[PDB]
Design an enzyme around this catalytic site. Structure first.
Site, PDB file in Angstrom:
ATOM      1  N   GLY A 282       0.793  -1.223   0.000  1.00 55.50           N
ATOM      2  CA  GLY A 282       0.000   0.000   0.000  1.00 55.50           C
ATOM      3  C   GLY A 282       0.827   1.274   0.000  1.00 55.50           C
ATOM      4  O   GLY A 282       0.321   2.331  -0.377  1.00 55.50           O
TER       5      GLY A 282
ATOM      6  N   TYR B 210      -9.839  -0.275  -3.295  1.00 60.97           N
ATOM      7  CA  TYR B 210     -10.842  -0.032  -2.248  1.00 60.97           C
ATOM      8  C   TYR B 210     -12.227  -0.100  -2.874  1.00 60.97           C
ATOM      9  O   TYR B 210     -12.595   0.782  -3.655  1.00 60.97           O
ATOM     10  CB  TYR B 210     -10.647   1.371  -1.579  1.00 60.97           C
ATOM     11  CG  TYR B 210      -9.321   1.579  -0.883  1.00 60.97           C
ATOM     12  CD1 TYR B 210      -8.195   1.993  -1.592  1.00 60.97           C
ATOM     13  CD2 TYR B 210      -9.202   1.422   0.498  1.00 60.97           C
ATOM     14  CE1 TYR B 210      -6.968   2.182  -0.952  1.00 60.97           C
ATOM     15  CE2 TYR B 210      -7.977   1.598   1.145  1.00 60.97           C
ATOM     16  CZ  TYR B 210      -6.865   1.989   0.416  1.00 60.97           C
ATOM     17  OH  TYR B 210      -5.657   2.194   1.046  1.00 60.97           O
TER      18      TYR B 210
ATOM     19  N   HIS C  51      -6.468  11.179   9.596  1.00 57.20           N
ATOM     20  CA  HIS C  51      -5.096  10.674   9.533  1.00 57.20           C
ATOM     21  C   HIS C  51      -4.238  11.466   8.554  1.00 57.20           C
ATOM     22  O   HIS C  51      -4.758  12.116   7.652  1.00 57.20           O
ATOM     23  CB  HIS C  51      -5.096   9.169   9.083  1.00 57.20           C
ATOM     24  CG  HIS C  51      -5.494   8.943   7.651  1.00 57.20           C
ATOM     25  ND1 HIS C  51      -6.812   9.040   7.246  1.00 57.20           N
ATOM     26  CD2 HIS C  51      -4.729   8.652   6.575  1.00 57.20           C
ATOM     27  CE1 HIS C  51      -6.815   8.807   5.944  1.00 57.20           C
ATOM     28  NE2 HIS C  51      -5.575   8.580   5.489  1.00 57.20           N
TER      29      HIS C  51
ATOM     30  N   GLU D 189      -0.457  10.561   6.162  1.00 60.21           N
ATOM     31  CA  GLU D 189       0.040   9.321   5.560  1.00 60.21           C
ATOM     32  C   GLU D 189       1.150   8.713   6.415  1.00 60.21           C
ATOM     33  O   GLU D 189       1.673   9.396   7.303  1.00 60.21           O
ATOM     34  CB  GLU D 189       0.489   9.539   4.095  1.00 60.21           C
ATOM     35  CG  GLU D 189      -0.650   9.878   3.145  1.00 60.21           C
ATOM     36  CD  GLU D 189      -1.749   8.843   3.069  1.00 60.21           C
ATOM     37  OE1 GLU D 189      -1.445   7.672   2.759  1.00 60.21           O
ATOM     38  OE2 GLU D 189      -2.917   9.193   3.339  1.00 60.21           O
TER      39      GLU D 189
ATOM     40  N   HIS E 274      -6.735  14.266   6.700  1.00 60.44           N
ATOM     41  CA  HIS E 274      -7.926  14.068   5.898  1.00 60.44           C
ATOM     42  C   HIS E 274      -8.819  12.923   6.424  1.00 60.44           C
ATOM     43  O   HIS E 274      -8.343  12.010   7.099  1.00 60.44           O
ATOM     44  CB  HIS E 274      -7.573  13.901   4.396  1.00 60.44           C
ATOM     45  CG  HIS E 274      -6.556  12.848   4.109  1.00 60.44           C
ATOM     46  ND1 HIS E 274      -5.210  13.070   4.329  1.00 60.44           N
ATOM     47  CD2 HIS E 274      -6.713  11.613   3.587  1.00 60.44           C
ATOM     48  CE1 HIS E 274      -4.591  11.954   3.968  1.00 60.44           C
ATOM     49  NE2 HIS E 274      -5.452  11.050   3.502  1.00 60.44           N
TER      50      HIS E 274
ATOM     51  N   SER F 135      -4.994   3.431  -4.847  1.00 66.87           N
ATOM     52  CA  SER F 135      -4.131   4.293  -4.051  1.00 66.87           C
ATOM     53  C   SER F 135      -2.743   3.730  -3.760  1.00 66.87           C
ATOM     54  O   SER F 135      -2.557   2.521  -3.622  1.00 66.87           O
ATOM     55  CB  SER F 135      -4.827   4.681  -2.743  1.00 66.87           C
ATOM     56  OG  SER F 135      -4.154   5.742  -2.081  1.00 66.87           O
TER      57      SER F 135
HETATM   58  O1  LIG Z   1     -10.281   5.613   0.106  1.00 63.39           O
HETATM   59  C1  LIG Z   1      -9.928   5.338   1.332  1.00 63.39           C
HETATM   60  O2  LIG Z   1     -10.681   4.900   2.157  1.00 63.39           O
HETATM   61  C2  LIG Z   1      -8.472   5.595   1.616  1.00 63.39           C
HETATM   62  N1  LIG Z   1      -7.930   6.710   0.871  1.00 63.39           N
HETATM   63  C3  LIG Z   1      -7.166   7.638   1.447  1.00 63.39           C
HETATM   64  O3  LIG Z   1      -7.310   8.033   2.608  1.00 63.39           O
HETATM   65  C4  LIG Z   1      -6.004   8.114   0.563  1.00 63.39           C
HETATM   66  O4  LIG Z   1      -5.931   7.847  -0.631  1.00 63.39           O
HETATM   67  O5  LIG Z   1      -5.101   8.805   1.205  1.00 63.39           O
HETATM   68 ZN   LIG Z   2      -5.007   8.855   3.327  1.00 63.67          ZN
END
Ligand SMILES: O=C(O)CNC(=O)C(=O)O
Ligand SMILES: [Zn+2]
Ligand SMILES: [Zn+2]
Lengths: 7, 350
Positions: free
Chosen positions: B166, B173, B184, B186, B272, B284
């Site tokens: 990841g 997802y 959170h 990264e 975010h 991702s």
């Molecule tokens: O889509 C999700 O649940 C995870 N995605 C994120 O938080 C990202 O790409 O940073």
């Molecule tokens: Zn994220």
């Protein structure tokens, strides 16, 4: 290691 | 920077095919415009550009660990518990997503769906097909290919031989109505790219990097037991704080809705959160620039868990800051980060 959404 | 984007609002970019070809050069260009100050940006790609010909052949794709999202709380403060469920196909997921029990409610304006979300987020826990290892990009696609972006983050794999799922590999997802992503930054304060492949929109909330400490201080006051156990408890990705709660305590923020075929960029130390409108699929990964190196060296990490993502900053300091290497090793490097300043690669756009 590994990226996660937690919980 | 303080002259460009002084209101720290989210910015949208519409590049041409020539502007879109070079990824890192465009990241540098949007930073020269002040986009990083919001902590989140939107990029609409050229209409001719397609990463895949059709999404009609993905029903047999397996989601190994789907998660039922149990939310607890009141008065705009919530805790999200992610429960692992048995493996299911995209076909099995879409049927549940579009069923009467879990489908998107009837609405006119976005403000109505947003009100519906914050009122119903603790009822009928939905399933989130998150953290799936994979790509939906075709092999021949050279422009903004999530599986191979070619940034300086490549040094971690090239020299160490380290693979982080990841972080330097793509994740898919599969969403449904009311599925959320908690507050959170990264891992290691990196940047992130988020492309929506198809389906219903994804809405985002962002807090400017320069006000990020103010959100941390607020979260610690609301969850003091969580703060004592872990320094970076927000990295557990379990805390939901509503926009009404942010406005009440004077925390600055902005909102944005991402539709199918659009790119979202998150910047270092940009907090975010958000939710999915209905059935969809996103791709991702994380990336870096020369500006990130200082953020990665100063990132406050999780202390209570042993599986957590931690990158050796040594290789980045040796190549990009050779003069500071001995100072940094002795712990004498006391650099104060300026969040308003753009990446050094933005030099040609000034
Ligand atoms: O889509 C999700 O649940 C995870 N995605 C994120 O938080 C990202 O790409 O940073
Ligand atoms: Zn994220
Ligand atoms: Zn922790």
């Amino acid at each position: 290691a590994r990226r996660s959404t937690g919980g | 920077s303080e002259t460009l984007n002084p209101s720290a609002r989210i910015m949208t970019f519409y590049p041409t095919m020539e502007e879109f070809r070079n990824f890192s050069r465009y990241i540098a260009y949007i930073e020269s415009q002040g986009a990083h100050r919001a902590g989140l940006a939107k990029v609409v790609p050229p209409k001719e550009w397609k990463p895949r010909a059709s999404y009609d052949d993905i029903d047999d794709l397996v989601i190994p660990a789907p998660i039922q999202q149990l939310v607890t709380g009141q008065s705009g403060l919530f805790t999200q518990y992610n429960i692992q469920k048995k493996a299911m196909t995209v076909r099995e997921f879409r049927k549940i997503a579009n069923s009467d029990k879990y489908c998107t409610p009837r609405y006119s304006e976005f403000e109505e769906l947003e009100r519906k979300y914050w009122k119903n987020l603790t009822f009928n826990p939905p399933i989130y097909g998150a953290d799936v290892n994979g790509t939906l990009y075709e092999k021949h696609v050279d422009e903004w290919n999530i599986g191979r972006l070619r940034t300086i983050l490549d040094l971690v794999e090239k020299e160490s031989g380290i693979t982080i799922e990841g972080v330097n590999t793509p994740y898919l997802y599969f969403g449904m109505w009311k599925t959320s992503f908690a507050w959170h930054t990264e891992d290691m304060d990196l940047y992130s790219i988020n492309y929506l492949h198809f389906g219903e929109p994804k809405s985002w909330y962002s807090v400017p990097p320069e006000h990020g400490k103010r959100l941390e201080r607020l979260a610690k006051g609301f969850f003091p037991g969580s703060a004592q156990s872990c320094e970076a408890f927000l990295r557990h990705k379990m805390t939901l704080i509503s926009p009404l709660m942010l406005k009440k305590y004077g925390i600055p923020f902005d909102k944005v809705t991402q539709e199918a075929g659009e790119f979202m960029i998150t910047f270092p130390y940009g907090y975010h959160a958000g939710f999915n409108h209905g059935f969809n699929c996103a791709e991702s990964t994380n990336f870096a620039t020369r500006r990130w190196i200082e953020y990665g060296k100063q990132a406050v990490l999780c202390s209570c868990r042993k599986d957590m993502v931690k990158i050796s900053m040594d290789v980045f300091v040796r190549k990009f800051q050779p003069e500071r290497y001995k100072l940094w090793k002795a712990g004498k490097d006391n650099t104060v980060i300026d969040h308003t300043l753009p990446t050094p690669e933005a030099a040609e756009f000034l």
